[PDB]
Amino acid sequence: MEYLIGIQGPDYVLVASDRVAASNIVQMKDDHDKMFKMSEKILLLCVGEAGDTVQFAEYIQKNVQLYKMRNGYELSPTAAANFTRRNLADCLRSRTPYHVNLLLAGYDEHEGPALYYMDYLAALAKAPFAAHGYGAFLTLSILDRYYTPTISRERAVELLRKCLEELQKRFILNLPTFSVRIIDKNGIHDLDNISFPKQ
Amino acid sequence: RFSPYVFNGGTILAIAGEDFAIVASDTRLSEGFSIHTRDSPKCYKLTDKTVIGCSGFHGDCLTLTKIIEARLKMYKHSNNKAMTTGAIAAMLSTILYSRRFFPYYVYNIIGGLDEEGKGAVYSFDPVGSYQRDSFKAGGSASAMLQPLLDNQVGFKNMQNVEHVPLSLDRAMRLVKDVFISAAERDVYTGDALRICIVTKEGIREETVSLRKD
Amino acid sequence: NQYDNDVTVWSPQGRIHQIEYAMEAVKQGSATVGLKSKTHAVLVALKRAQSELAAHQKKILHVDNHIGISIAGLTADARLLCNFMRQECLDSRFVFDRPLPVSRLVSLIGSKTQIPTQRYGRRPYGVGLLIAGYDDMGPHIFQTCPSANYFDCRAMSIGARSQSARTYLERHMSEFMECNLNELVKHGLRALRETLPAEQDLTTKNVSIGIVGKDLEFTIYDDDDVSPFLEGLEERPQ
Amino acid sequence: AERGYSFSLTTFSPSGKLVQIEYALAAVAGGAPSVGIKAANGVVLATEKKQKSILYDERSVHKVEPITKHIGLVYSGMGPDYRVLVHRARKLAQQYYLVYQEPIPTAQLVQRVASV
Amino acid sequence: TTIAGVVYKDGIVLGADTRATEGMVVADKNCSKIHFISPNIYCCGAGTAADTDMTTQLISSNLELHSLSTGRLPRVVTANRMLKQMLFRYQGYIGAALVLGGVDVTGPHLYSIYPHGSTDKLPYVTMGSGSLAAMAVFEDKFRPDMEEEEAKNLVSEAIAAGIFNDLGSGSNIDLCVISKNKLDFLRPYTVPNKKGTRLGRYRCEKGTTAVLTEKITPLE
Amino acid sequence: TTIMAVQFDGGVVLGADSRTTTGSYIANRVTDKLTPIHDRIFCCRSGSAADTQAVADAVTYQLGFHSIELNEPPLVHTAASLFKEMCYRYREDLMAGIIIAGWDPQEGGQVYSVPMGGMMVRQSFAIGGSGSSYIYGYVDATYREGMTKEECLQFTANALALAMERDGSSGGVIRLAAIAESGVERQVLLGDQIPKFAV
Amino acid sequence: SRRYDSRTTIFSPEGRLYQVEYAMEAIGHAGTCLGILANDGVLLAAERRNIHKLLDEVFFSEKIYKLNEDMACSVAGITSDANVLTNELRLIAQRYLLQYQEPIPCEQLVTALCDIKQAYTQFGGKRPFG
Amino acid sequence: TTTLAFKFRHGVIVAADSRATAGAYIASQTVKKVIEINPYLLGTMAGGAADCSFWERLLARQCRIYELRNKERISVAAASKLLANMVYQYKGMGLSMGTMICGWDKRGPGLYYVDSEGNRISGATFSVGSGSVYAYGVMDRGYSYDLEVEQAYDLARRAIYQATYRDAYSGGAVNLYHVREDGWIRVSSDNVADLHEKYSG
Amino acid sequence: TQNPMVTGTSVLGVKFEGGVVIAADMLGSYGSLARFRNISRIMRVNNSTMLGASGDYADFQYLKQVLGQMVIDEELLGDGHSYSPRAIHSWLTRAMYSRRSKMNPLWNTMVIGGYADGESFLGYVDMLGVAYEAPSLATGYGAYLAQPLLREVLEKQPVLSQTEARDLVERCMRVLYYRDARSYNRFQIATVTEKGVEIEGPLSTETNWDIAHMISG
Amino acid sequence: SIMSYNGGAVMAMKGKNCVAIAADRRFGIQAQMVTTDFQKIFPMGDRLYIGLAGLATDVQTVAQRLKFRLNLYELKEGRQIKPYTLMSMVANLLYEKRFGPYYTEPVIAGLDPKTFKPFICSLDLIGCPMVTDDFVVSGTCAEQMYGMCESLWEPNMDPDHLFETISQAMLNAVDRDAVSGMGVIVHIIEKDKITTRTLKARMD
């Protein structure tokens, strides 16, 4: 399985995923991006079942962009986070269950940054930092060690290098690169890809 | 508990000449280990230049014949012509695919003259896919018959030979042989044999006798 | 005048206006004759053109391999009742492996055109049929109306100026039983030639013949298949 | 058989009135007199019973019905329309009592009967 | 659960225990197993606790609505059909098992209703886990027609054999006496056993345990 | 359980036994399995106790409605055909051995067997239930065409008495019912009135 | 049938909707009801249209409904119709709360009602909400 | 069943074997594997034969409706997202369908891979089918973005030839296709027996 | 119908010159127990067709209502048509075939012999919608016991006489009664000629057990 | 079951004019702990708390779909909800999903707005009401807390003794369960005020 990780600073949210789309033993793609801008200040990282993520990201992204245009003022992250959970919980008991795992990271103007965690059962819960996939087990220990509530964007990428350098050493999957983004009061800026030279 | 199929044997075969289309099948309809009846052609004339051969589960042959033989008329009233072979082959594919989640169990060999006036044969699987071929056998002895046509009609794995087209005389005597040789080794082929020749003058039917064992 | 806006109202006199009217839609249609023998039934129809540069609308519609019809009324309604019959005769091949016998086909048209003359705000089908079929009782003709009645005939005509034909057919109804095939069609044409104005005649570009027999699945003749029947035809002098 | 009409028969007039309700209030004012008096520990609902011979059995019908252990009705106007509302009320009360296991408050019952 | 019923000359005596278990752990030590249907038709429920509660209330409402309309007492027959045909339309996934007694304008009746919709009209019934223990005590000491006080004594003494000799049954015995003129719904009626008293004070006070936050919030 | 119906000239003689097993515990030891469907048509319910009760009620509902619309005493063959329609439509859910037999004002006494499948067939004497197995000989040797009402009420007693000694799901009291043009003469055999064959 | 149809959802020759226009005049008879905005809150004033010596008051207000925790509204016109619209509002505003888990924005609550008031004037052939 | 497709500077190369089996038995050795959707989209066909023929053909109907309404050819990007949604409604019904939409767009050459399981990923190299693993190897050692159009025809043959040679459910003729900017051109139809005598010596 | 309950066994049929002749034993068996000793597994469909059912007896009675009412409905019109044997036979194919697509089949096998237009006709219908005409038939366990004797004779000469057939079918019932566990002693012969459909009542079969003394010696 | 998949504890306890409801805080996906603070106690008006333990999804649906019925009842009617009804109201909501149930088991603590009578109760995952006067528990450590409270309780306690008891009763029952712990919060409700203290538990 793949790999997401978010770290909620005191004025920004730092999210990173891997960039692999594997089917069988081979990697089809290596620049495959899992972030879905839902607004100016809301990222929804999906992952999990092959088909469900792409359907269930388009479906949320297209009701959050509706809601911005009908009214005029984009959703909060607290709103959008509960809006996802609802949809994902109502498809839990029907013909077609969306087996996805999510991270919704966003930065509100009045309530600051927020980073939400979604089990595929649709159990929402705010956190200060979370991870998905099997790589979760290796890095959630490294975040606990070094993560404090006040931590500058510089020290955070340095903390995220440790987590993604662990995965290189102990983990058994290939995961060469990681897209990194960061949300704050200005919007979504892409940082440089943490990458690992195997050439 | 209940099994909605049974395998009723039957072997179907078809060669596309250059102005003629053979479609030839045994008639033995058998279930299990009994022989239900000895005559029951697997060949139904559709148009004036199109035979179709169903073989497999005989409950579905009957349905799939009456369905095609209806959507054949239905087409004629709306378009005021008869269908070409090239069309029936496409149409039959959709019908078959319509039941993709409880499929027909019918191997279909359509043979007739398309527009130019040439032999054409189309091979279907159960769920409805088809290419155009120059000869296909199907059914039970499909694995007996397919290599003796690759050789005589396809000249495959030979060298230093002619390639003069397939004669209407060498075909029929070819068919009659390969069926006499599948009736020795396969237990679902026997009793009789309808050869349908389809020239531009209509459709003849020739009956030959196989071994009743 | 208030009893004319629905099939649903009766009139004090004991009729229904909306059903009477519908039948005027039939008398606007183009003349057509049907007679039988004891081996053949024939539909002879006088097509019509609405311009000089224009073809003629088809009066004879092929139904099955032993049933023809000849419409007269709204054509959009005639192809709504033709698709339903085509569908009734593909239901019989497919279940009983036989041709649907005509008497039991005209009884389904009868059950389906009855319905909308008794429901609110639906109309009657504005088309009259002549049904030439041949099964295990020899030949038949059947006239259908928008009222939903029908009749077994020995030789009927509908459409415009059809009355002129009905008399010609009623003086010769004795001779029909003994005709060969080509002699019958002559009668039909000579009857259909009494429905025209006196100034013009039957040509090959506005006559349509439909023949069904004991050994002959229902066919249709147009243009130059009609010439072997106009040639040889008597002259009609005034 | 039928489908049913779909278009309301109560319609606004140029006045700004719903003429049908205005008339149905005049039927109300033809009906048998009924008085109501809240006390300070009880409510009294009294009504002029209907009869016009000595043949009627004045105990086979009731213009004072019980809706619940703690509710009552009388009415003024058409007698058939009263047996319909008494019967939709008694069911409202039973859906309410089936979900909260509690007798339906009287403010509630009137607010629902009214919406029928 | 053991529930039991008996017909004596005047009316009915329905007996229930009061222990209701969620598995092998006693969840409730007082559990009303005797449900009011109408003013003259009480009903005992064994089997799935959550099924009888919502089955009986549903009948009670179709039956207190059916009493206003006739304007007289509802019959025990009517509760016996509604229960029977509601349970049979759920093919037996509603796991209620009922003892529907009541005194009529036609004598007292008593019914068993089983999950699948089988109804049996007897003069004394037992349902539930220990039921068989009960049915032993009836099959020994039942006489048709007996005093008002022989029935109360008999039915408690049957719930008693249920209680001591079966698990899932225990604590108080509830009786219900229905008669054509009274209705003595007793709860309890016997305390066959009660837990003893603690031998010390094992609790403490004044800051036993640590805190980390204290937020006080006043109201009006 | 064992049920039995015999046909003599005036009418019919039904016979059942009372015992509803539920495994090896007996639930009700005095059950009434001779259910009146009308005034002179009885059914004998066997097989699943809850299924038959539903069906019986449903046929009474239709049959009584049906006799008032004709103003005629319904036929036995009618109340048969209604069990037939019922048990055949729902031959998946149910499992109901019925034995309709009654006296008709225009065909005599009749007995119709309706076994598990929803078949229907008229019979001189029928016999059903789980203990019926054990008395097909005794009932095939001892029955002779033509009897009196007093040779039948003793015949079924003997039959159902054998079927209770051997079957485990039969016991208790015997209930007979003679149905004639006269009326219905229900009686109960218990204790010593039950014939005995011990040896 | 067609004779007894009012045709309440159909244009005038002039370019109006007569039923919606009459419904206005029915509102010109209800009790006066005014509202004033401030910087430090906002207030509704309405006059009791029905007053009498026997009439009682049981409810905090006879014209002000609470639609939410944060919103109230006052009605004017046909009182019967007002018991319907105020019940859909409450249900709308909870259905908003059940998704986004916030209190519903002021503007949206209104438009969401005005889709229901507007539907009735355009198809179905019911009389509009007055 | 081995199809491969790789996007380079002068367009897209679609390559396909053609042996199609019915078990251990070989049904036909000529089954077209590349589907002429339009004259400017190529599909492939690598899961079930029925299923890729039926849906790709149904896509061709959609993309010819789309053409008439909007008055502009449909994007390759767009025609892959249309084929994803049709098939995502049968998720878990048991289809197989490994298709690749290739074409030329307003944003240049593009190439998508659509699956039965709801995958829709553009890329630059793909292989789908029984042999796909054998192709990725030989293809990824000789692949560049910048090739000449004569080297790329050879690389594709060589990479299908090497897949049929190891794999059992691969063989027959090697069909080769070239999506150029105006429309695709059927490059050649070779045979594995003839490519065996060109590459051995 | 997932499981058959009461079930008859085997139906012989054989053509001859101017008629067809059906046989079938009168036993309906419910497991091993031979439970309903006098059921009729011959139906008369109008006056030129007949119908022998093997298989689940309750499902056979459910055709007997449908065919009944479906035949009455042709004779009400009295328009001079009927249902041929060739038709009634088709119509049952569709009957089974459709019940076989709801995964809810009629569990009968059926021989439907008739005589119309100087021509005999003898169809067969499986619970799967298999169907076909032959000159001899045998459903169930007669497919392996009577079939070879009926087919041995129709190789020699394909024509039979009214006297050759009714002897040939009374000599194949003897084979079932010996070697089939669900057969009975009383069977019915039904015949169509152009005089109609004549159904002979219960006929016995005389068997010899002369080989019951050769088991030792 | 699958109510173990997340774990959870709740516990109510009657005083003599007060009631205290206590819960653990730990949202964990099997063994792996995700977040240390995940509320299982919700306000349902004042002096009325519903505690939902079990499957963390339904914990959140049932507190949202129960707020939607409650609010739509405190508006439509002016009264404020009674603690006996909030039991019957949440019984019906579970039983509405009879087949394919929710996987929570409500615990309701609270005082009667019109007096201050204390009132607690639990429910089964299908919606059976169980009114007690001692204490009610639900969770995966149910059997741990039954034993612990049966001998640590008194028939009458003041607001200071209650919070002593339930505290030292939760800490020891939830520490003997794998998938619970890591922070206990306790509301305790008087007529006057609602005090809410968090206990210092073992973060392992």
DSSP per residue, C107-173: HHHHHHHHGGGSSTT-----B-EEEEEEEBTEEEEEEE-TTS-EEEESEEEESTTHHHHHHHHHHST
Q: Do chains B and F touch (3 or more CB pairs under 8 A)?
A: no
Query: Rounded to whole angstroms, how far apart are CA atoms B185 and I148?
Result: 24
Task: Name the CATH superfamily for F1-199.
Answer: Aminohydrolase, N-terminal nucleophile (Ntn) domain (3.60.20.10)
Whether F119 sits inside 8 A of I1 (CB atoms) is: no
Phi, psi of B103, deg, nearest 5: -65, 160
Residue of chain F whose Cα is closest to the Cα of I104? F92
**From residue B201, how far is each of B20, B204, H108 by CA, in Å?**
10, 9, 54
- Residue J175 burial (CB count, 10 A): 15
Q: How far is E207 from chain F (nearest CA, A)?
A: 59
Chain breaks in chain B (C to N over 2.5 A) after: none
Whether B62 sits inside 8 A of I101 (CB atoms) is: no
**Residue E57 CA to chain centroid, in angstroms?**
14
Q: Give me the amino acid identity at F149.
A: K
J131 is written with which tokens? 């009114």
Query: Rounded to whole angstroms, how far apart are CA atoms J169 and J153?
Result: 9
Is the separation of the CB atoms in I8 and I57 below 8 Å? yes
Contact residues for J7 (Cβ-Cβ < 8 A; gap 6+): J24, J26, J28, J139, J140, J177, J178, J179, J180
Residue of chain G whose Cα is closest to the Cα of A70? G108
Whether C90 sits inside 8 A of B73 (CB atoms) is: yes
Strands A102-107 and A42-45: antiparallel
Upper half-sphere CA count for residue D90 (Cβ side, 13 Å): 21
By the 10 Å C-beta count (0-12 exposed, 13-18 middle, 19+ buried), B16 is classed as buried
β-strand partners of C136: C138
At the topology level, CATH places domain E2-190 in: Glutamine Phosphoribosylpyrophosphate, subunit 1, domain 1 (3.60.20)
Query: Rounded to whole angstroms, how far apart are CA atoms E175 and E192?
Result: 13
Residue of chain G whose Cα is closest to the Cα of A90? G99
Domain ranges of chain E: 2-190
Query: Rounded to whole angstroms, how far apart are CA atoms C209 and C225?
Result: 9
Query: Rounded to whole angstroms, how far apart are CA atoms B134 and B18?
Result: 10
| Per-position DSSP letters for J10-38, written without gaps between them | EEEEE-SS-EEEEEE--EEETTEEEES--
Tally of residues, chain I: 217
Whether J100 sits inside 8 A of A92 (CB atoms) is: no
Is the separation of the CB atoms in F19 and F170 below 8 Å? yes
Phi, psi of H85, deg, nearest 5: -70, -35
Residue I150 DSSP code: H
SS3 (DSSP) at J174: helix
β-strand partners of C208: C45
Q: Chain G within 8 Å of D42 (Cβ-Cβ)?
A: no
Tally of residues, chain B: 213
Domain ranges of chain J: 1-204
Query: Rounded to whole angstroms, how far apart are CA atoms H102 and H11?
Result: 10
Is the separation of the CB atoms in G32 and G46 below 8 Å? yes
| Per-position DSSP letters for H61-101, written without gaps between them | HHHHHHHHHHTSPPPHHHHHHHHHHHHHTTTTS-----EEE
Nearest Cα residue to F7 out of F128, F110, F104, F113: F110
Whether A71 sits inside 8 A of G99 (CB atoms) is: no
Is the separation of the CB atoms in H101 and H36 below 8 Å? no
Is residue E1 part of the annotated active site? The answer reads yes
> Which residues of chain C form beta strands (DSSP E)?
32-36, 40-45, 60-64, 67-70, 129-135, 138-144, 150-153, 155-158, 208-213
* CB < 8 Å to G84, chain D: 115
Residue J77 DSSP code: S
Whether J160 sits inside 8 A of E206 (CB atoms) is: yes
Is the separation of the CB atoms in E174 and E189 below 8 Å? yes
Query: Rounded to whole angstroms, how far apart are CA atoms C212 and C227?
Result: 18
- Phi and psi based region of residue H138 (left: phi greater than 0; alpha: psi -120 to 50; beta: remaining): alpha
Residue G99 DSSP code: H
Query: Rounded to whole angstroms, how far apart are CA atoms A22 and A24?
Result: 6
Query: Rounded to whole angstroms, how far apart are CA atoms E103 and E112?
Result: 15
Domain count of the fold of chain B? 1
Is the separation of the CB atoms in H1 and H130 below 8 Å? yes
Report the residue of G65, G97, G104 to disrupt the J interface, i.e. the one with the largest count of J CBs within 10 Å: G97
Sign of the dihedral defined by the CA atoms of residues C125, C127, C128, C131, in that order:
negative
Residues J183, J47, J76: CA angle, nearest 5 degrees: 125
Is the separation of the CB atoms in E197 and E63 below 8 Å? no
Residue with tokens 């440790």: A162
Whether F119 sits inside 8 A of I5 (CB atoms) is: yes
Nearest Cα residue to E90 out of A95, J102, J99: J99
Whether D16 sits inside 8 A of G22 (CB atoms) is: yes
Q: What is the dihedral of CA E51, E57, E59, E60, to 10 degrees?
A: 150
Residue of chain F whose Cα is closest to the Cα of I33? F133
Query: Rounded to whole angstroms, how far apart are CA atoms J170 and J149?
Result: 9
Contact residues for D4 (Cβ-Cβ < 8 A; gap 6+): none
Query: Rounded to whole angstroms, how far apart are CA atoms J167 and C59?
Result: 96
Q: Which of E1, E18, E55, E56 is catalytic?
A: E1
* CB < 8 Å to A126, chain G: none
Query: Rounded to whole angstroms, how far apart are CA atoms D81 and D71?
Result: 19
Residues B12, B17, B22: CA angle, nearest 5 degrees: 30
Contact residues for B196 (Cβ-Cβ < 8 A; gap 6+): B22, B23, B24, B43, B45, B51, B111, B203, B204, B205
For residue A169, give the CATH number of its domain.
3.60.20.10
Element (H, E) at B115: none
Q: Identify which of F20, F25, F54 has the shortest CB distance to residue E88.
A: F54
First to last CA, chain B: 33
Nearest Cα residue to J55 out of J115, J8, J109: J8
Q: How far is E216 from chain J (nearest CA, A)?
A: 5
F178 is written with which tokens? 């003679």
Q: Give me the amino acid identity at B93.
A: S
What angle do the packed helices H76-88 and H49-70 form, to 10 degrees?
A: 130
* Catalytic (active-site) positions of F: 1
Query: Rounded to whole angstroms, how far apart are CA atoms B38 and B192?
Result: 8
Strands A4-8 and A13-18: antiparallel
H86 is written with which tokens? 């049709």
At the topology level, CATH places domain J1-204 in: Glutamine Phosphoribosylpyrophosphate, subunit 1, domain 1 (3.60.20)
Residue of chain J whose Cα is closest to the Cα of G101? J64
β-strand partners of E113: E98, E119
Q: The domain H1-201: what is its CATH number?
A: 3.60.20.10
**Which residue pairs from G6-13 have beta carbons closer than 8 angstroms and sit at least 24 positions apart in sequence?**
G6/D7, G6/D8, G6/D9, G6/D11, G6/G125, G6/G127, G7/D7, G7/G125, G8/D7, G8/D8, G8/D11, G8/G125, G8/G126, G8/G127, G8/G128, G9/G121, G9/G122, G9/G123, G9/G124, G9/G125
Q: Do chains I and J touch (3 or more CB pairs under 8 A)?
A: no
Q: Chain I within 8 Å of B63 (Cβ-Cβ)?
A: yes
Upper half-sphere CA count for residue E39 (Cβ side, 13 Å): 12
First to last CA, chain H: 26
> Which residues of I31-179 form beta strands (DSSP E)?
33-36, 42-45, 49-56, 108-116, 119-125, 131-133, 136-138
SS3 (DSSP) at G19: helix
For residue B138, give the CATH number of its domain.
3.60.20.10
Contact residues for C180 (Cβ-Cβ < 8 A; gap 6+): none
Query: Rounded to whole angstroms, how far apart are CA atoms C116 and A137?
Result: 73
b/e code C144-155 from CB counts within 10 Å (16+ = b):
bbbbbebeebeb
Chains in contact with C, where contact means 3 or more Cβ–Cβ distances below 8 Å, are B, I
Q: Chain J within 8 Å of D95 (Cβ-Cβ)?
A: no
Cis previous bond, E188, omega within 30 = yes
Report the residue of I76, I79, I92 to disrupt the C interface, i.e. the one with the largest count of C CBs within 10 Å: I79
H15 annotated binding-site participant: no
Q: Chain A within 8 Å of H134 (Cβ-Cβ)?
A: no
Task: Work out how many CB contacts closer than 8 A connect B with I.
Answer: 44
SS3 (DSSP) at I142: helix
By the 10 Å C-beta count (0-12 exposed, 13-18 middle, 19+ buried), H77 is classed as middle
Element (H, E) at D90: helix D79-100
Whether B66 sits inside 8 A of C93 (CB atoms) is: yes
Nearest Cα residue to D106 out of D61, D43, D33, D40: D43
Nearest Cα residue to J58 out of J106, J122, J121, J115: J106
Q: Chain C within 8 Å of B73 (Cβ-Cβ)?
A: yes
By the 10 Å C-beta count (0-12 exposed, 13-18 middle, 19+ buried), J24 is classed as buried
**Among D residues 3-62, those touching chain E with beta carbons less than 8 Å apart:** none
Is the separation of the CB atoms in G72 and G44 below 8 Å? yes
**Residue H20 CA to chain centroid, in angstroms?**
15
β-strand partners of F129: F2
Q: How many helices (H) and strands (E) does chain B have?
A: 4, 12
Is the separation of the CB atoms in F4 and F15 below 8 Å? yes
Residue with tokens 């878990």: H92
Sign of the dihedral defined by the CA atoms of residues J111, J117, J122, J123, in that order:
negative
In chain C, the domains with their CATH numbers are 1-234 (3.60.20.10)
Element (H, E) at I70: helix I57-77
Element (H, E) at H123: none
Residue with tokens 């008329």: B73
Is the separation of the CB atoms in A101 and A119 below 8 Å? yes
β-strand partners of J185: J23, J198
Q: Give me the amino acid identity at J106.
A: P
Q: Identify which of C95, C107, C136 has the shortest CB distance to residue I91.
A: C95
Give the residue numbers spanning the domain of B69. Answer: 1-213
Query: Rounded to whole angstroms, how far apart are CA atoms F121 and F114?
Result: 7
**Resolution of the structure in the document, Å:** 3.9
Query: Rounded to whole angstroms, how far apart are CA atoms D29 and J46?
Result: 48
Residue D12 DSSP code: B
Strands B43-45 and B50-56: antiparallel
Residue of chain E whose Cα is closest to the Cα of D67? E68
- Residue A65 burial (CB count, 10 A): 14
Whether E122 sits inside 8 A of F54 (CB atoms) is: no
